[model samples]
Target: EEGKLVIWINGDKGYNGLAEVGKKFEKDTGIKVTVEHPDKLEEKFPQVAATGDGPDIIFWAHDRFGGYAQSGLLAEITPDKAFQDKLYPFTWDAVRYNGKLIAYPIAVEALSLIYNKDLLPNPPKTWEEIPALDKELKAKGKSALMFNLQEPYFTWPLIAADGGYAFKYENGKYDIKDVGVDNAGAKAGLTFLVDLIKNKHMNADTDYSIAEAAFNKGETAMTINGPWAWSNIDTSKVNYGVTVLPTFKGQPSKPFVGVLSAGINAASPNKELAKEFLENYLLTDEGLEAVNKDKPLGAVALKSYEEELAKDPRIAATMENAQKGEIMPNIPQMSAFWYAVRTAVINAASGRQTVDEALAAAQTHMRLAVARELLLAALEELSQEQLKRFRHKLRDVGPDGRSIPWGRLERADAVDLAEQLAQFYGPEPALEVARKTLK
Candidate 1:
């Protein structure tokens, strides 16, 4: 127990990277570090954390930081200026939540144009150049570009190429109520994507696996993907290269950037050791090198590695593209965005609906969904008496004048119940209830 340190990583992909570093750390400090990938880790984290027993450290992307920090599950950190200066500027924001630093960033990633260097010696510099390349490639039974068209994560650059965002971040905080998914700029972005599919420049049936398969087999000249996908690519089959997402109408696309970070668990008994491992070992040259030796994590966040990272073209391109992009939103409310935007991208791209129609539907759906979550949260804050009263109020209401059963409700039913709660409680009564509870 004294020498052991445990860290829970979300997935199995990056274990080797950390394990190598862990071995070196043990040899150097006599502190044994075990990197683990637990099943259903994301779902299990909060439950485990609440019991004062879990990993000493949690290694994952920055997108989950806001929720963890807000829930009091992550330890707050304050790195000295020397350590702060060691990392790239954007990485600082990635580990921060609610004006406090909650984690240590190690690597950064963003969606980038990954192309087959042998198939196309030069990557296209702009969206305008794609059609000609597509035409040429199609003649040879190949495609110029391919990606998961329905995935919101990959398509955001195109959606934001004009000016679309799931939430507007202003004054250092996200204005969650400001839903921009269906705004005019978003319509413009999706329109361009639909145009690409309609004109046969890209395959409409592509998902992540489909696109990865084609790219690995050298069937597609180019694909847009992130560093996590690098390990899956068969480099021997295709000489690939990475570049910033190409410009659209002279404007550079802004893909969502993500940071891989490690945070000390607030409940951990070994906080000091966890902090030492993160700062001295995990963020050091030896640590970073071990992590990237075999499967590179696109770009290292350490400023000292800028020269080294640039020596490799793929890592260099990833760093450049990440700096040009926007950091992915770290709020819990972002959960409401995925399904709505994904459906919109798919419907609009496949000709089932016009860009305008699809996005409009996404906007309405997202708005209601956000409201539903807020209302549900408000219900969670109710006291026993308040909850009993609220349930009693809903007891008489049913779809066909039948009494509504409060037990055994599905998530969809919960959303409907939340809507019902809103009428009796007023819209977003959570805000009012929370304010009152706090005061």
Candidate 2:
């Protein structure tokens, strides 16, 4: 049989860029590699995988890997210990689901400040320094930093710049129940952005394309952007320099580092060809080169490419920002956050209320949302006896009650049940996934 490999990659900037590399993969292995994109990988993968309808290899973000793996649908990889040791440690940790390696992370992505090298000699080190430079730019009919303020995903890092976080880390997993959006630092950060908007240095209505176009056209000197943007702006034309975002009140603006990775479908029709493509081609220097093209592919994950990885200024700056950046929480609970934070951003920028009030309202919304989910989950863990007791209680203790015992259950039986339940369900603050192996 002819070797055929089908892979699904999310439709993003660097995603289709891999098309050229797929051609190389086919030539290298005689495998016909056809890459496809699901209309919506997030919703479609779980539904489609159930029917065994899809690719042998699926490229995706690390955040969804846990849910996919737990769904009993991803392939296991034989550990290449040498390969494991070469990647960035955070990235290596990202690929594992239940302590088993389920994917190979190709790159780590985080936002960095991209500026016109012609305008600024060096990157601004602090927020306080931006205005003077902004004044200089404005005098020449240009603007300073601009990003889509309406887009919470990119602008939300302002919360981190002042040492505030959306969720606190606890017991190794993020504590979704604890939200810090309304913290003093978060309030100050948002207020500062609003002040800049009021002063005409920035715009609350700046959309992403507008931000990118302004910088490319030299109407603005810099923008908060990602690796994907770097490829679109040719260095020769842009005269741009990339660096980690400056600090506000002495704390760095931490971007969320989203890892793009490749995983094998457990039920892939061409699993062998897919695995071979991953091992023999995708991990190699040539593979990395084809995907990276000439851009810094955003903190690459290869041990063999250490020399090139260190040599790239963009990747180096990304790593520096990422060390301070919050690793975006990959769990399902993050869905609630996506909604809460976006609402907070819109409400604050629109002037309906103060930033603090908007965040506090969002915090209340998250707690109610999370609480409902927790209660529903708790119901799922209800033991058979617990259910039987409730049903029996209804039958035995209605209006003509006292016919059956209510408070006189056996102590020994209850004690035994309690111990068994403890073994099955650990005490929580959380329902930690115990299925994971530490490897």
Candidate 3:
């Protein structure tokens, strides 16, 4: 009981793989393991840790590493050359704040320029290079590039390729006040995004499904996508190439990188065992493979998996692009950054607002969003809810919406109606006895 490890993870598939890794760790070391799935691990973790109660190990992403690590909620790992040397340089940087390592890199993701090699033989090297290629694709009666036009995560590289950034950083310090989402480069980028459709290169729809289907069906010659798109793409149906999201003119497109990782809780009840599992077993090839068994969601971080991943062009491309990309900042302000950027992108793309007009609106929206988030977070302290039981699984409802005896309701439909409610036999009893009280 003393050495039992508790791991908290999110997303069903992500947790399944990590849970299997936990099981194997238990089998190998005789250290018991329990993996818990929280619907909102990112938001709940800090709250739970504030109470000095939670998992010893958390299986999540690095974007959140900054917040918790900065506040001392996370335990600082050794980051010895043996550990740091095992992971790629950029991946190592992802788990670090200023200079200290905070996480063991698990899997990683970044957008790549994916193209139908049959229609467009080579990926574009730059944004302007895309126009010439677009002419060729148009000659072949196809669109050049397709992407989720409204997702800020998808649009960051486009904005950044033209020299836009989410926040200003100087001397290793993030200036949370100087947000750059609506800067001149972002205006340029979003204008170019809308022109991709306004000039009739691709259709004007911003729906993600439409873009994914367009690429898989070869309706578009190219697209910007991450490793997650592989499942929706039918490999046998098309020959494709993937690499870094294209640079624009002299400016390089720094695609936003997302890192999957494991961190130790500073207040973990089973700190020793948790640290051992993360450092030794979890980063190993066998452990990574088990975690990826459900699906190779992204490129695994350790050098051991490089050869294996490179064999699959998808993961190889993700790893290559991730190295070329910037780590999407894990700072708390990014929540409003997403909404604000998405607004500027969608409005500009939809042709409903000028680039100048869209960005102006976005900056205001971002201010409002941040204030709203803080206002609501302040209110969240009032109540907390926990799950105890699932009604449908435990009992069946009758035709009139009452949990009467299971089969006893047979031929009993005519037995009661208004009478059932008064007697507390209906699903919503008038007596207030149907619902369980919160503990």
Candidate 4:
């Protein structure tokens, strides 16, 4: 007997819209779909993956799917050339790792500067210029930026766009042994954040809800956030405009792009049917359009919807911002990088450490972790002699190739040691060696 296609989704307006679309698809194709919103989907996903008996389709971001793909839990989909060719390049790139498309992207949400035009007649051109602007607003007893500085999610983009990438990629994978959090660019970004706090231009008291409330009440002039707040943020009281984040010293502030995609479970009994349902119901023009109409989430479908729904300002704004955004990296170790960058930014902002010290510490810890991870990975592929050579040079690769020794290993030797350790004691032992030796 053929089984029904099951899709797990996060609870949001977008999911609700997809549920309705699923009904329509069932009517059209006679493929049954049961959408479920279970508790702790992130934690539950891996367990389901382990059994290979989970839902056929899932709605999640590519970044979250990284670990699954790395572990062979996800099925490669780029083998289907026609499906690959139909997607937008950025959308396709969001789900691809080593040329395998792991998911079908449905929607994208990029960061933008949302400001109350009634409060700020003109937004500053760059983040550096923001300080002065913030000062002027504060002098008038108004809050300048609307955001929660305590959360790393809010500050990571600023760190990344200011020429601070999380980890270096070599030979088709990320080398964590060389973290860049403490690099000059990262330090500069942290310093700017610290100054914002020290000058009383930014505060730790503001969360998402507070920012929305304050903005609606005209307590703050502007903030940096995504489109999720559009429905909640009452822009009717004031004229507001959304634009990309200001550059920092001529460097554009690249925001982290969040994308929701559909992936088939590798262990599904009805694999082919699930794939057909995903491609035909989730990724197609008619299906995506129906979902977008019910709850517009800045999806990744064709631009035909734009022509049909040009009158909707929110959709228009999403399309404008999506063009300027980048596909956030979906590397498996991205979670670690997220923590590393956030910790550095928060430490600097909260006066716990100087910008230089905070970034340096983050870089050191992150790079060491990455190095250890990479070393083990190399050990899996290289011979003892080759591994030994790689281990010896682990310290040499610096953040952004800036070559700051900071008491670290050279790249080649590090990989060599990693490979040798794995070969001698197995992969787990190699990881232990990396954990102790890389830092």
User: Best candidate, TM-score-wise?
Assistant: 1
Error of 2 at 70 (Å): 4.4
**Candidate 2, residue 288: CA error in Å?**
1.9
On lDDT, who's better, 1 or 3? 1
Greater lDDT among 1 and 2 belongs to 1
Q: Considering only N, C-alpha and C atoms within 3 Å, which residue pairs clash in candidate 2?
A: none
* Candidate 1 per-residue C-alpha lDDT over 93-180 given as tens digits, one digit per residue, 9 for 90 to 100: 7887877889999889888899998889999999778889999988999889989876888888878877788888776677778899
Q: Residue 176 lDDT in model 4?
A: 49
Query: What is the lDDT of every predicted structure here?
Result: 0.80, 0.72, 0.72, 0.68
Q: TM-score for each prediction? A: 0.82, 0.77, 0.73, 0.77
Return the lDDT, model 3, position 186: 77
Model 3 per-residue lDDT tens digits across residues 169-218:
55445665566767788777777777777777656665688788888998
Taking every candidate in turn, the Cα RMSD to the unseen true structure, in Å, is: 5.2, 7.7, 14.4, 7.8
| Error of model 3, residue 283, in angstroms | 1.1
lDDT by residue for model 2 over 1-439, one digit each (tens)?
1357777876653555566667887776666777787788767787777677767778888889889988977888764777677666677666766557788877777888898888776868887777788888888888778888877778877776885676776545567778877788888888887777777778778899888888888778888988778867785398888888988998889888887788888877676677667776777788787776634466777756745775778778877777678777666777777788888877777777688888888777777667556644653565667645533433332223343333443332433333322333432322231111101
lDDT of 4 by residue, 1-439 (tens): 2557778887664666677767877888787777787887867888987676677777788787877777777777643666665755566667777657787777777777888788887887688877778778888888778776766667766766666766664444555455666777777777777777787778755677777777877788987777777766654456777766777877777566677877777777777776777776666667777677666756464445444554555555554555555467777666777777777676677777878887777766666566557655645576656555545644443335553343334344444555445455455545654544444
Each model's number of backbone clashes? 0, 0, 0, 33
> Which is better, 2 or 4, measured by lDDT?
2
After best superposition, candidate 4 residue 289: deviation in angstroms? 2.3
Candidate 3 vs. true structure, TM-score: 0.73
